[PDB]
Design a protein around this ligand. Structure first.
Ligand SMILES: O=C(O)CNC(=O)C(=O)O
Ligand SMILES: [Mg+2]
Ligand code: NI
Ligand SMILES: [Zn+2]
Length: 331
């Protein structure tokens, strides 16, 4: 078996290997990359996502979210408080202000220490989940707005045509902005490109060990667990690497820099934080190997997780027994 310790693998495709997305994901998995739950892909030196980022300041962040933490430094939840709309220009200026900017630090490790020590005492503002794309329409390779759709993948594998569309989302981050522990909707893959700015640190649990994370989460967030059998779908819980080590949960960590792709694999729990002002783009995708994960994915039916239009059909076709109860949570 390839990659039996489930280490995060880093790939360096040639421009020739960068032509066929599906085939390169399949290549990564042949080398065991999926076992880690996350892989990094450094694009060929000839590749660019677009010419410059000089003209992005007028993008609107309609609902910036202030991420308010509760709990202890290592074990906390966050809620999202809606703020007034601002432009990317305005957000960048905010991220760089004395109140929000990245503190002096030595290296990524010092910064990680400071994150876990101090995150809960601040409430950074995240421009998340903005529909759109920063890829130039003439970028032909690994353009996240031109990937094959999950609906077409399900049709090709299962023979059923379904409604729904699949488009990318932009994330504008600042120091301490945080993504809680989660897998993707319907345990899909995701791909994330860091277009610009400061790095993003990621933590991931191997898919074969996801249930161990879930069990620890039920113990650490006992009221949440009683409220919903899949409460990590709410995307609110944070557990530090120190806490995971103390409880023997296998995980890995890696820092993504501007110009690099990250791929998360089905049922790979991940969490992380931004180092400073940045902009990432991400999208979910499927392969034939996803189908069996989709059929087994947990679902939130307490009503909190509230998800896209397109998830209906996935639940309807792949999880017909769950469909009724899940849709009652959606309505
Ligand atoms: O970039 C972020 O804030 C979070 N991204 C992801 O969880 C992802 O791409 O799967
Ligand atoms: Mg603009
Ligand atoms: Ni994710
Ligand atoms: Zn729920």
């Amino acid at each position: 078996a390839q990659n039996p310790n489930c280490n995060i693998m880093i790939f360096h495709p040639t421009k020739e290997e960068f032509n066929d997305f599906d085939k390169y994901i399949a290549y990564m998995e042949s080398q065991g990359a999926h076992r880690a739950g996350l892989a990094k892909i450094i694009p060929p030196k000839e590749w660019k996502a677009r010419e410059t980022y000089d003209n992005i300041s007028e993008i609107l962040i309609a609902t910036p979210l202030q991420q308010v933490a509760s709990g202890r430094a290592g074990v906390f939840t966050q809620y999202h408080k809606k703020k007034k709309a601002m432009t990317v220009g305005e957000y960048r200026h905010l991220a760089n202000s004395k109140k929000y900017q990245t503190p002096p630090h030595q290296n990524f490790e010092d910064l990680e220490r400071k994150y876990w020590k101090n995150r809960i005492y601040n409430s950074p503002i995240y421009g998340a989940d903005i529909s759109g794309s920063l890829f130039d329409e003439n970028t032909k390779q690994w353009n996240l707005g031109h990937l094959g759709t999950i609906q077409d993948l399900l049709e090709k594998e299962c023979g059923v045509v379904i409604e729904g569309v699949n488009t990318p989302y932009l994330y504008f981050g600042m120091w301490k902005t945080t993504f809680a522990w989660h897998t993707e909707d319907m345990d899909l893959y995701s791909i994330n490109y860091l277009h610009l700015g400061e790095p993003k640190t990621w933590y991931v649990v191997p898919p074969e060990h996801g249930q161990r994370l879930e069990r620890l989460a039920r113990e650490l967030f006992p009221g949440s667990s009683r409220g919903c059998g899949a409460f990590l779908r709410h995307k609110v819980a944070l557990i530090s690497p120190t806490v995971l080590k103390e409880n023997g949960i296998p995980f890995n960590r890696i820092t993504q820099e501007a110009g690099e792709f990250m791929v998360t694999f089905p049922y790979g729990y991940h969490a992380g934080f931004n180092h400073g002002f940045n902009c990432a783009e991400a999208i979910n995708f499927a392969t034939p190997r996803w189908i069996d994960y989709g059929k087994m994915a947990s679902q939130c039916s307490c009503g909190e997780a509230r998800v896209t239009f397109s998830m209906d059909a996935f639940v309807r076709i792949l999880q017909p027994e769950r469909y009724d109860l899940w849709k009652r949570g959606q309505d």
